[PDB]
């Protein structure tokens, strides 16, 4: 019933501006403050400040002075966060939250991911990872695919069109440059490969590409 609904994800270039929204419902908007919280990818939570929804007065922690602006459209029960002169380190999920008399951060929006990057849409290179034909083997063998140099996220990696999943590890993407790289491993019985084909399937929706790489001894 009490809800805060935030606008969708934004991709911006360094030096640009972004404005994100937080629409409230289920209560009287102007009765409770709205707080903003930043979470950098894989990091913790950091309070940015708040806006008084009666007076409209925003207050920022010193970490968020300068380039950050909280605002309201009270007739639409909406709070906004604008970030000016975007920097790489502004890449983060931003949450809005509403106060209660008992706690400043009582009800939370779902977050809005803001990505700051100068990268252009780039499809991945997909490279096979295989043992040599005459390598010593055991009960299981480990194969893989290197998914290198793409933007934006996400890619989707699958093995044998999803038929192999119990032995799969697909690693989270990491920035190698302004581009992402990830890798995926699959372990299967040695009695299974190379006797049957094993193929990694790498979809990158943003570039309209889907690459299949059959794994052959290498």
């Amino acid at each position: 019933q009490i809800q805060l609904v935030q606008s969708g994800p934004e991709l911006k270039k360094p030096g640009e501006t972004v404005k994100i929204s937080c629409k409230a419902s289920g209560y009287t908007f102007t009765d409770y403050s709205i707080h903003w919280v930043k979470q950098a990818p894989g990091k913790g939570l950091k309070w940015m400040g708040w806006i008084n929804t009666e007076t409209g007065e925003p207050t920022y922690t010193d970490d968020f002075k300068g380039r950050f602006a909280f605002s309201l459209e009270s007739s639409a029960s909406t709070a906004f966060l604008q970030i000016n002169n975007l920097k790489n380190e502004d890449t983060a999920t931003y949450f809005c939250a509403r106060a209660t008399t008992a706690t400043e951060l009582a009800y939370w929006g779902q977050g809005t991911l803001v990505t700051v990057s100068a990268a252009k849409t780039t499809p991945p290179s997909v490279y096979p990872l295989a043992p040599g034909s005459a390598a010593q083997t055991n009960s299981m063998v480990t194969l893989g695919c290197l998914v290198k140099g793409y933007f934006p996220e996400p890619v989707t990696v699958t093995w044998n069109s999803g038929s192999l999943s119990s032995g799969v590890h697909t690693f989270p993407a990491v920035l190698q440059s302004d581009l992402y790289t990830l890798s995926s491993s699959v372990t299967v019985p040695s009695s299974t490969w190379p006797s049957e084909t094993v193929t990694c399937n790498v979809a990158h929706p943003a570039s309209s590409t889907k690459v299949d790489k059959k794994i052959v001894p290498r």
Partner: protein, 217 residues
């Protein structure tokens, strides 16, 4: 600012068993108005934070009563009477007594299981990559427990690398293990200036590292 210290950083728990995590402040959170503004949030993987506890011990409506908050002044504790799968995630405590509002660093709940040594695999650059003038050497360190691990790259016996890209999985939903990928990326030209490429995994399961190598050939 008020420093919120959460311990431990990572708590291993067992489904159906109790758990306890500590949050201590650098100064008393007892407000001059009589209230103690100490709060707990849970953030589940891929999710936004959710309020669990406010005013030290008050449960938010709908929050499972397997959660109990306690403490006073500077020392607080969140207890789970019986851990369930849904409880896994990062817990944050935060204080609203002293502006600015500050958070603890979070404590992560993970599942206890038996120790397991990594299974280590090394892969030379593929012919396809070499054709493009690049050379990535990939090392998988798979299905180990507990989560802490160290990888080292050596080239011709010397601690050294170039572009190393490391990635770690979250706890595996199937076997409760962890895995790591480490990629060393050189130009083909540089790759060809050296012979021996080695990935060394150090893990609490052995005093001796797991060493995987190949000689370019």
């Amino acid at each position: 600012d008020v420093v919120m210290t959460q311990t431990p950083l990572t708590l291993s728990v067992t489904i159906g068993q109790p758990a306890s995590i500590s949050c201590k402040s650098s100064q008393s959170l007892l407000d001059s108005d009589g209230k103690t503004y100490l709060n707990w949030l849970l953030q589940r993987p891929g999710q936004s934070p959710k309020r669990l506890i406010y005013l030290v011990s008050k449960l938010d409506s709908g929050v499972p009563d397997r959660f109990t908050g306690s403490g006073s002044g500077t020392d607080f504790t969140l207890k789970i009477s019986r851990v369930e799968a849904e409880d896994l995630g990062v817990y944050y405590c935060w204080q609203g007594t002293h502006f600015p509002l500050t958070f603890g660093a979070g404590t992560k709940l993970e599942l206890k299981r038996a120790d397991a040594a990594p299974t280590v695999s090394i892969f030379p650059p593929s012919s396809e990559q070499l054709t493009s003038g690049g050379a990535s050497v990939v090392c998988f360190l798979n299905n180990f427990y507990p989560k802490d691990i160290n990888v080292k790259w050596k080239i011709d016996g010397s601690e050294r690398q170039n572009g190393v890209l490391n990635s770690w999985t979250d706890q595996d939903s199937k076997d409760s293990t962890y895995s790591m990928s480490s990629t060393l990326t050189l130009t083909k030209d540089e790759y060809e200036r050296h012979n021996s490429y080695t990935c060394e995994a150090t893990h609490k399961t052995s005093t001796s590292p797991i060493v995987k190598s190949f000689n370019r050939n």
